[PDB]
Amino acid sequence: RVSSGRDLNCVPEIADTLGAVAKQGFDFLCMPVFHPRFKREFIQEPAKNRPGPQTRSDLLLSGRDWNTLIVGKLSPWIRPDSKVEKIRRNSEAAMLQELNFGAYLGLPAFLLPLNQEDNTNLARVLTNHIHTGHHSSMFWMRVPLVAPEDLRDDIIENAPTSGEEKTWMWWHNFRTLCDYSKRIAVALEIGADLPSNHVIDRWLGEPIKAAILPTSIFLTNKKGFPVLSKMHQRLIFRLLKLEVQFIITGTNHHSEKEFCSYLQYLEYLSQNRPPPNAYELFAKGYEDYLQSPLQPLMDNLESQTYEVFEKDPIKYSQYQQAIYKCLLDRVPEEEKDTNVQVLMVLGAGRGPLVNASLRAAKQADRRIKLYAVEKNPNAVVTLENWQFEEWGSQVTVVSSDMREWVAPEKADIIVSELLGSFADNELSPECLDGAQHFLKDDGVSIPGEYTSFLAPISSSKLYNEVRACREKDRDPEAQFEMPYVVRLHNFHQLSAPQPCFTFSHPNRDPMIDNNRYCTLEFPVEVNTVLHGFAGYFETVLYQDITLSIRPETHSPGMFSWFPILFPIKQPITVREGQTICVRFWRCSNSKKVWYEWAVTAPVCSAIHNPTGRSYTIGL
Amino acid sequence: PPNAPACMERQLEAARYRSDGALLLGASSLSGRCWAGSLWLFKDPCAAPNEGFCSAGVQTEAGVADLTWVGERGILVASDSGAVELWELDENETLIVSKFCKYEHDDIVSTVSVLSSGTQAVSGSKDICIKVWDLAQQVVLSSYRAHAAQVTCVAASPHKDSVFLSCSEDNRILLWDTRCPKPASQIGCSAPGYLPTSLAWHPQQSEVFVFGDENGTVSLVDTKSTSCVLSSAVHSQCVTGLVFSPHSVPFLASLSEDCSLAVLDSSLSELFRSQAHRDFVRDATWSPLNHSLLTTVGWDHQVVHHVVPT
Ligand SMILES: Cc1cc2cc(C(=O)N(Cc3ccc(C(F)(F)F)cn3)CC(C)C)ccc2nc1N
Ligand SMILES: CSC[C@H]1O[C@@H](n2cnc3c(N)ncnc32)[C@H](O)[C@@H]1O
């Protein structure tokens, strides 16, 4: 299903227009609150004292209709950035008059045009209206994909036809003056002559709430029904992934067919999109939703937290397959009945790896002895109920910390799922290092290696959400110095993911040191604004068996982990050809472990989270 | 009168005199429950805008932004609905019947002008498009997108069937000639001034025209030249229209949003001024019967008959 609206600049009577628009299938209506040609004077008499009402009464619709069906439109004669002072003073008062009347009707959105480069005074008036009272209405900025001058036909003979990205700089410089207001979104206007994919890819990271589609860009098939080019369809398809509201403007040029045929073609493409990836279908409702990263070592996870871990069959089948191949390599065929392996699930949780180790033992036709070490006593109750009713004396539930547990015997294999979005962000190195002593000298660790990957991203939405995570009684910028687990959606990857930290288990190093310093340089072949760094990870369970949330090597179907996000305090502008240089540290003391990061090129940022002042991981 | 609106909307938008003396009126409602327009014929000009004393009348679907005569009985209308409407008077000249209503512009049709050939007319609109119409076949012959802003005003050449001026908020004044492969040619002051607002060819010299800007300055420009011949600061606000008197040596009637009317000579020197209006002055027309009368309408619902000292 598609949410759509009808843009109109002429409404004789609201009752009849809203009904005809509703009959054609539109959900809302874009219309001017004052008459477009009703220019008003606020200073100079006698035009100042114009009698009569300035517009029509609010009683023409219900409050429920205004709140959900009518989208306001600024009058086209209002030019706050004019060069004549008299035109500015009236445009200021007229914009405030229409914006206040828009909030008077409780309109959910308001349309304002970004049809030129300098909208500074326009930004100030809107900012003053935003900082007047507390409201939540949206302001849709009308900005075209390609500028009107860059879309004119070469009909003039004495004036023939980064410069092709000029409309984005209109928006970027506007929202920056308004300090990234949450009430200001983009109403992206599409032209017949689409621009470069660079400009298109750049708008994708912006809060595009509406997509305006004129009727002049629609093609005509043999039957006469309005369609689109193979480029416009590729644009509409990627707009549907952002789940935007499409707006139809302009009169009916396919007058042979009904005007609602434009709308039926959009629902046609929407139901013809590629089948939703099971990752998209499952993680629906978590797009760009920031979550605090889990700390299963410092905290005890709730039951429904473990329940989301176990809803992924692909994740544990890979674990079963890794243990299955490791069993066949350690015990030969002639020793399949005399050699019993000592498996130790370090961090058994509610026993999904214990069940997987049992299925890997039956599949390999080998004998095993299981120790289920879990520190969470609330989860040990589940393990011991499992151990008594089903597993039997084969599994030995150990309610202790693996770093402290004195094992009665050494282990042939140790299996752990102590990995987060950034691989080692749950202190899996420190846990397996403490548990490393009761592993045999030829013992195998599953996983035996994991690696975290970083990618610079651009998302003015995600930056605006982190910016909204400010809390009382703490550092006002502390929200920018902590990572968030989040399914990244409305963002733009600025460079290919590069590896960051890497750990190997068992750690044969005599001087074990899990502190890391990694410097990464990212070629950025586009102009953009850096907002944060995405964090993925790859891990090697055993030999070819691997897991990964890294996009290019993502394990198909595995939806257990979301990517992690390291933000930066101030967004950094990056030009084409420049290289983003970020540096990450993994610091630790006896009690806490934390990450510190800083950008050093093109410009330098501040060192984020020093001494773990804003974010620490508990040992 | 029959098929006649009981009352006409307050904002009088246009006033055009016919050759015989009848006054064509165009009003539109810019406030209130209903936003529409109407068309009126006043064979008696001194009875306007009283609706009970009108010769003919009809109300349109939307508002009347600009109108012009098409001969002696046709009325071309630029509607807010994005349509260029043509209305014709019946043989009785008591009813106004719609000829065609073609929705070809995607926004408000802001200006319209009939070419000298009588069978064609150009229309400018806020959709950034100028269209050359064929009044006979009721079809758009050409659609030009040469401007980058909303087209402010288009004006046809007096005796050239293919020449017409245009200006938009992109600070461009385009001289058109559909006989050329690239018909538009940007003219005016090479240095970008304030935005043009109104255009008016000279009724005698086929190369001379005047234009007023948003700052209140009326300029005298020759097309063969490429720089201002003469200019004068006439109004304190945006100049809405410019109309020339039907004299041999013609006067220039300027009207603006400062609720004032001015009549200048060939040197743009003021010879007459009238603050008779209390709101915006929208149109001005000279009487073909008495060349010293000047009928002006405005948004204050006044139809003032100005005696011009000539
Ligand atoms: C074993 C393990 C798993 C981890 C998972 C995650 C992780 O991504 N979320 C966010 C999330 C993931 C999936 C879904 C949905 F809806 F798709 F199922 C929703 N929300 C935490 C959540 C599972 C409680 C973070 C750290 C983890 N650490 C671990 N050791
Ligand atoms: C299945 S998610 C990680 C599990 O491992 C457990 N765990 C984490 N760290 C340790 C540790 N040092 N010793 C024992 N269990 C642990 C946690 O309690 C959680 O149930």
Residue numbers in the entry:
A (entry chain A): 13 to 173, 180 to 637
B (entry chain B): 20 to 329
Q: What did the study's authors say about this model?
A:
PRMT5 preferentially methylates arginine within the short consensus sequence “GRG” but derives additional substrate specificity through binding to substrate adaptors, including pICIn, RIOK1, and COPR5 (9, 10).
To elucidate the binding mode of AM-9934 to PRMT5, we solved the crystallographic structure of this ligand in complex with MEP50:PRMT5 in the presence of MTA. In the resulting molecular structure, protein domains are organized as previously observed with the PRMT5-TIM barrel domain in contact with MEP50 on one side and the PRMT5-catalytic domain on the other side. AM-9934 is located in the catalytic domain in the peptide binding site, where the arginine substrate would bind during the catalytic cycle, and in the vicinity of the coinhibitor MTA. Moreover, another H-bond is present between the carbonyl of the ligand and the amide of Phe580. The quinoline rings are also in van der Waals contact with residues Glu435, Trp579, and Phe327, and with MTA. In addition, more nonpolar interactions are visible for the rest of AM-9934, where the isopropyl moiety has hydrophobic interactions with Leu312, Val326, and Phe327, while the trifluoro-pyridine group packs against Tyr304, Val326, and Phe580. Residues Tyr304 and Phe580 form a π:π stack with the pyridine ring of the ligand. The molecular structure of the complex allows us to rationalize the preference of AM-9934 for MTA-bound PRMT5. The natural coinhibitor, MTA, is in contact with AM-9934 and its sulfur atom is at 4 Å distance to the ligand primary amine.
